[PDB]
Amino acid sequence: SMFSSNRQKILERTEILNQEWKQRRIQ
Amino acid sequence: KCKYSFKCVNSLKEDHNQPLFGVQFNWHSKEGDPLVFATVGSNRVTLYECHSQGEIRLLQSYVDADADENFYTCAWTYDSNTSHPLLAVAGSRGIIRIINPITMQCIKHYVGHGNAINELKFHPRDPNLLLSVSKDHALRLWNIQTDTLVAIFGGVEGHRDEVLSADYDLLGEKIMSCGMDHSLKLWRINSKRMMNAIKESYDYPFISQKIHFPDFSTRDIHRNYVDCVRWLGDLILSKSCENAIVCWKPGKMEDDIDKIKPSESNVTILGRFDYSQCDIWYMRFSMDFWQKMLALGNQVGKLYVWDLEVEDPHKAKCTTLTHHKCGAAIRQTSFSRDSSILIAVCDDASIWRWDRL
Ligand SMILES: COc1cccc(C[C@H]2C[C@H]3Cc4c(cccc4OC)C[C@@H]3N(C)C2)c1
């Protein structure tokens, strides 16, 4: 499915971004 | 079927009474930190904090010394060294200003762009890589750490009229641009040429790359100005004058985005998100961080929201957000990082806060 596969790519790639946001050093 | 519900909890109007063209929440602030958004319009840049019970707390405002300046866009980043937030702004004067939000002062500026800057975007992985799209038909990639112009995307096979919008994909490997020439163009930044160009801007007059040829080009989606473009995974969402956001992809239904050749002639229209009374140029659509929601304001002050997790773009429709005092054109909307708040900015300098239910 075009939808199911595209949704999984968004899921994995936003997860990678979210992890980087979580890890981010401050002050 | 869509489940998302919102309640209008507050509104205000900025004293300049001029159109607000841009709104952006800071998606870099960490969990628990105050929810902050910036608005842009006229010669002003304004910061607000979102508090409980729909309270919208004014933090500070930047008033440009040039009264004739009209800001069109803003984008958030962070200083990779100090870790503190930074805000980029630009418009009609073609000058990129890097504001420190703590003091709301211009700490460095970039000139060069032949004219007005229509949109700014920060790279999703590198906080130093700023993309600007201009009235001069070109896109420019900047490194705000070394103050270098990494690349100019335009020329021989570049845009033929104003570049109106552009978006990096999720991993920051490629940009999709759009404008007044009706075309959407692909620019790969994960090429050996570009990766080395970026690496060289960090080693640093610097010699900018001139990217005359895009990696894909189509004029088969819209029949008027393309004012907004955003990636949806490997697919693209774009809009024009025509009351629809079109979901499409370069090549054939089964073709891979990374297997597309620069001469590819096919496009596949996967779907259309239909709405009404948004037949005026210069109206942005937005998505939330997880790309589960899609929002667009119309010219009579109605706010459309769709559920991107429902396959058919007819059943995807949420209930339209409306308020009898909100009748002016909604130029742009912004979701807070956690999708709990939706801000809409208008042609009459009004701001509207909608909290999720
Ligand atoms: C908010 O969505 C946008 C989508 C794409 C690009 C932009 C920046 C644009 C702002 C435009 C505003 C405008 C123009 C002419 C007459 C009245 C006007 O204001 C009601 C020309 C400007 N344009 C060429 C650049 C905004």
Author numbering:
A (entry chain B): 40 to 66
B (entry chain A): 77 to 280, 288 to 440
Paper quotes:
Polycomb repressive complex 2 (PRC2) is an essential component of the epigenetic machinery, regulating gene repression primarily through methylation of histone H3K27, which leads to changes in chromatin structure and thus exerts influence on key biological processes such as embryonic development. The minimal core PRC2 complex is composed of three protein components: the catalytic subunit EZH2 (Enhancer of zeste homolog 2), the WD40 domain comprising EED (embryonic ectoderm development), and the VEFS domain comprising SUZ12 (suppressor of zeste 12). EED contains seven WD40 repeats and adopts a canonic β-propeller architecture with the ‘top’ portion for H3K27me3 binding and its ‘bottom’ portion anchored to the N-terminal helix of EZH2. The recognition of H3K27me3 by EED and the resulting increase of the methylase activity are believed to be crucial for the cellular function of PRC2 in propagating the repressive marks at the chromatin loci.
To elucidate the binding modes of EED396, EED666, EED709, EED162 and EED210, we determined the crystal structure of EED in complex with each respective compound at high resolution. The crystal structures were solved using a EED-EZH2 peptide (40–68) complex, except for EED396, which was determined using apo-EED. Similarly, EED210 also showed a good binding signal to immobilized EED (40–441) in the SPR assay with a binding affinity of 35.1μM. As illustrated by the biochemical results, all five compounds do indeed bind directly in the H3K27me3 pocket. The phenyl moiety of EED666, the furan moiety of EED162, and the methoxyphenyl moieties of EED709 and EED210 all make cation-π stacking interactions with the guanidinium group of the Arg367 side chain, with the characteristic face-to-face orientation. While the central rings of EED666, EED162 and EED396 form π-π stacking interactions with the side-chains of Phe97, Tyr365 and Tyr148, those of EED709 and EED210 are involved in cation- π and Van der Waals contacts. The amine group of the octahydrobenzo-quinoline moiety of EED210 forms cation-π stacking with Tyr148 and Tyr365. However, they exhibit significant induced conformational changes for residues Trp364 and Tyr365 (with a movement of the respective side-chain of more than 5Å), moderate changes for residues Arg367, Glu238, and Met256, and minor changes to residues Phe97 and Tyr148. Together, these changes result in the formation of a much deeper pocket as compared to the original aromatic cage found when H3K27me3 peptide is bound. The manuscripts for the optimization results for EED210 and EED162 will be published separately.
